[PDB]
Amino acid sequence: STFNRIHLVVLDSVGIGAAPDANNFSNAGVPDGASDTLGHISKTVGLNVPNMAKIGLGNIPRDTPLKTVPAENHPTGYVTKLEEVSLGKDTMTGHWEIMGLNITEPFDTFWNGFPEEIISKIEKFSGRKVIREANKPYSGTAVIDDFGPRQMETGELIIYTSADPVLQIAAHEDVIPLDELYRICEYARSITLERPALLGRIIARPYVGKPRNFTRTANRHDYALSPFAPTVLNKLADAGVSTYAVGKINDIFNGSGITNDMGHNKSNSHGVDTLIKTMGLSAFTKGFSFTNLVDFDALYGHRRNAHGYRDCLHEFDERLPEIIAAMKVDDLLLITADHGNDPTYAGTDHTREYVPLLAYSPSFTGNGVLPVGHYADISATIADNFGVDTAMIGESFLDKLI
Ligand SMILES: [Mn+2]
Ligand SMILES: [Mn+2]
């Protein structure tokens, strides 16, 4: 194995400009072809990311340069941008492709709530009406505050969603028995396996308490889809190669091919702490770490907050030298994203964009820019490095790094 360890960090949603097929995707009816997460942030609120620029962020080919991220004539790493092949721009699709799958049946998202077929089906199975005013994207903690009292009186189901392909059912334990909530969720899981209702995850959300003061209970159950084919995580795990997960990674893959889940992040910074700790483990002598830093997407992209997005990027850039200081000489660091989420754009959804790829190792004997590639080339490079099979798609760029 050329690199003894590889650390892949996903800056969730950090796109670097509309993809060739961007107009096949949209935001509140507006096609994605004008989106440009990094570029639009830079030209509106500014963007100071000297540590990523030094690796070569400003060397990645673009029609027009990042306004405030200059090219670097003496870069320390290799950079390029990667194009998504899968027909979805959601988080699960992007990560699964980064690990080598080609998703041609993209998960459905429901900005206007679940269709009548799904709701009507669940209503008939459960014998309970669904509260239609709650069938829409909704803070899980606010929907319970808003319709909890009603549910306590009527026993109606509260079914809601998020920006993700997720269906959640909140049900007060006093009026809706756990056993029943689970059966309903299982039935729900069974009728959402194909488009136009393909759901990544069904979540039972039991809760207790009283009006204006509710508490979610540990009786939560999840019903998630695993990758439909072995990914490079499976290839590594099957070969006895360690796979460490940080952040949303375990959830996204439903644990498939993950030997060491380090758990959810409290925040990006707490995630970077956890990655640094993981890198320092005496047991972690060989293998792969896979970290998702989600704040860019959840707090800033979806909320169309460019100022905050900028700050979040700056704060990651400030911590990047800590990650690098913790690398062994024969470690490789890869930084990328899973789609865009342009905070200057119409809508409040992800945007179909190229994603940056930054590559760094102290053992590098060269630097510069790689040919533009595809998401799954990341998986193939990792597979190549550890001498395991590729999954569905992807081509290694390992030979360019050595
Ligand atoms: Mn994402
Ligand atoms: Mn998102």
In DSSP notation, 113-142 reads ---HHHHHHHHHHHS--B-GGGSSB--HHH
Tell me which ligand sits closest to the C-alpha of residue 294: 1
Tell me which ligand sits closest to the C-alpha of residue 298: 2
Is the Cβ–Cβ distance between 72 and 54 less than 8 Å? yes
> Which helix (DSSP H) or strand (DSSP E) does residue 170 occupy?
strand 166-172
Structure resolution, Å: 2.0
Is the Cβ–Cβ distance between 304 and 37 less than 8 Å? no
Question: Is 74 assigned to a binding site?
Answer: no
Pinpoint the alpha helices (H) of 287-348.
295, 306-325
Q: How far apart are CA 268 and CA 112, in angstroms?
A: 30
Interior CA angle at 333 toward 235 and 82, to 5°?
75
> Which helix (DSSP H) or strand (DSSP E) does residue 279 occupy?
helix 268-280
Give span(s): CATH 3.40.720.10, the chain. Answer: 1-104+226-402
Is the Cβ–Cβ distance between 101 and 229 less than 8 Å? yes
> How many Cα neighbours within 13 Å face the side chain of 166?
22
Give 299 Cα–ligand 1 centroid separation in angstroms.
Answer: 12
The torsion angle over the Cα atoms of residues 345, 271, 362 and 388, rounded to 10 degrees, is -90
Distance of CA 114 to the CA centre of its chain: 22
Q: How far apart are CA 277 and CA 4, in angstroms?
A: 17
Give 12 Cα–ligand 1 centroid separation in angstroms.
Answer: 5
Give 258 Cα–ligand 1 centroid separation in angstroms.
Answer: 19
Which amino acid is it at 253? Answer: F
Query: Among 234, 229, 248, which residue's Cα sits nearest to residue 90?
Result: 248
Interior CA angle at 377 toward 372 and 379, to 5°?
155
Q: Are strands 201-210 and 221-224 parallel, antiparallel or unpaired?
A: antiparallel
| Residue in this structure with the two tokens 């550890």, named with its chain if needed | 386
Enter the tokens of residue 231: 């990914």
Is the Cβ–Cβ distance between 340 and 349 less than 8 Å? no
Tell me which ligand sits closest to the C-alpha of residue 11: 1
Architecture of domain 1-104+226-402: 3-Layer(aba) Sandwich (3.40)
Is the Cβ–Cβ distance between 353 and 15 less than 8 Å? yes
Own/partner pairs for 235-241, CB < 8 Å, 24+ apart?
A: 235/383, 235/388, 235/389, 235/390, 235/391, 236/287, 236/288, 236/382, 236/383, 236/386, 236/388, 238/388, 239/386, 239/387, 239/388, 241/286, 241/287, 241/288, 241/386, 241/388
Residue 196, preceding bond cis, omega within 30 degrees?
yes
Give 155 Cα–ligand 1 centroid separation in angstroms.
Answer: 35
The answer for residues whose C-beta is within 8 angstroms of residue 283's C-beta and 6 or more apart is none
Query: Determined by which method?
Result: X-ray
Q: How far apart are CA 175 and CA 153, in angstroms?
A: 8
> How many Cα neighbours within 13 Å face the side chain of 171?
27
Domain 105-225 class, CATH top level: alpha beta
Give 339 Cα–ligand 1 centroid separation in angstroms.
Answer: 6
Q: How far apart are CA 226 and CA 191, in angstroms?
A: 16
Give 294 Cα–ligand 2 centroid separation in angstroms.
Answer: 8
Tell me which ligand sits closest to the C-alpha of residue 302: 2
Question: Is 12 assigned to a binding site?
Answer: yes
Strands (E), 191-301: 201-210, 213-216, 221-224, 242-246, 260-261, 287-293
Give 248 Cα–ligand 1 centroid separation in angstroms.
Answer: 10
Question: Is 302 assigned to a binding site?
Answer: yes
Q: How far apart are CA 268 and CA 317, in angstroms?
A: 12
CA distances from 331 to 290, 327, 359, 379, 381 (A): 13, 6, 11, 16, 14
Give span(s): CATH 3.30.70.1250, the chain. Answer: 105-225
Q: How far apart are CA 280 and CA 277, in angstroms?
A: 5
The answer to whether the Cα torsion of 56, 57, 62, 64 is positive or negative is negative
Q: How far apart are CA 10 and CA 200, in angstroms?
A: 20
| Residue in this structure with the two tokens 């009786």, named with its chain if needed | 219
> Which helix (DSSP H) or strand (DSSP E) does residue 270 occupy?
helix 268-280
Tell me which ligand sits closest to the C-alpha of residue 303: 2
Give 242 Cα–ligand 2 centroid separation in angstroms.
Answer: 28
Give 338 Cα–ligand 1 centroid separation in angstroms.
Answer: 5
Question: Is 338 assigned to a binding site?
Answer: yes
Q: How far apart are CA 157 and CA 377, in angstroms?
A: 44
Q: How far apart are CA 241 and CA 377, in angstroms?
A: 19
Give 338 Cα–ligand 2 centroid separation in angstroms.
Answer: 10
Interior CA angle at 29 toward 14 and 225, to 5°?
60
